[PDB]
Amino acid sequence: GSHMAGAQDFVPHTADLAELAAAAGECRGCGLYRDATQAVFGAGGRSARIMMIGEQPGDKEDLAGLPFVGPAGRLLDRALEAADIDRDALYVTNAVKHFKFTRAAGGKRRIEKTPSRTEVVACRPWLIAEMTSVEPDVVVLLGATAAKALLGNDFRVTQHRGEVLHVDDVPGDPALVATVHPSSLLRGPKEERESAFAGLVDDLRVAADVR
Numbered sequence: 001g002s003h004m005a006g007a008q009d010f011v012p013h014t015a016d017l018a019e020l021a022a023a024a025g026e027c028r029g030c031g032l033y034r035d036a037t038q039a040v041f042g043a044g045g046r047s048a049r050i051m052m053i054g055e056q057p058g059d060k061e062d063l064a065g066l067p068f069v070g071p072a073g074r075l076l077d078r079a080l081e082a083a084d085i086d087r088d089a090l091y092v093t094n095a096v097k098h099f100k101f102t103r104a105a106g107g108k109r110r111i112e113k114t115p116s117r118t119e120v121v122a123c124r125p126w127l128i129a130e131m132t133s134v135e136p137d138v139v140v141l142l143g144a145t146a147a148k149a150l151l152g153n154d155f156r157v158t159q160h161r162g163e164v165l166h167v168d169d170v171p172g173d174p175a176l177v178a179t180v181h182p183s184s185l186l187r188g189p190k191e192e193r194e195s196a197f198a199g200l201v202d203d204l205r206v207a208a209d210v211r
């Protein structure tokens with residue numbers, strides 16, 4: 001096998017977020033563009049100092065064209081308010097920008113499926129473009145896929161959670177904070193979810209206090 005070009009062929013020579021988001025709908029960097037409605041790019045402006053990265057769009061994100069609009073987005077807004085963070089002062093995006101899903105005989109119309117490492121690596125040039133555009137001071141990695149996208153396939157959020165990290169190789173050398181994805185707070189033991197929500201708030205407060 002070989003290392004793929006992925007999305008790089010499709011990223012234009014621009015740091016403008018609107019031009020990048022329009023170009024991302026034309027991306028064929030992996031197979032996910034085929035069945036998805038549209039690219040789900042980031043939301044926010046280049047003056048943000050804090051960038052947050054999730055895994056991929058969900059069903060409602062794919063329909064709306066923006067990240068974190070489903071129930072996960074409600075929980076994200078709850079956490080952000082608890083951490084004194086204005087959502088529109090952030091740039092929020094996802095490691096993978098087309099909805100990966102399965103249809104099914106019966107049941108839900110579209111069932112989210114985990115992006116493979118190949119798709120995360122293929123879509124990573126868009127992340128690099130976004131970080132070049134926004135020049136964030138701190139990046140919050142919401143969940144295991146977003147964290148692995150910038151920190152390595154073998155990165156474990158449980159090993160480093162809440163730490164303020166630096167990778168050798170991300171534009172602008174922001175501080176990075178790996179934390180829980182808000183969707184994980186929709187399922188699991190109730191008191192573990194409340195503990196993990198508190199910890200998410202802690203990690204967000206830490207990210208916002210990074211100078």
Ligand code: SF4
Pocket residue numbers: 006007024027028029030031032033039096097098119122123124126
């Ligand atoms: S997922 Fe990322 S890489 Fe695959 S097609 Fe959509 S934009 Fe291009």
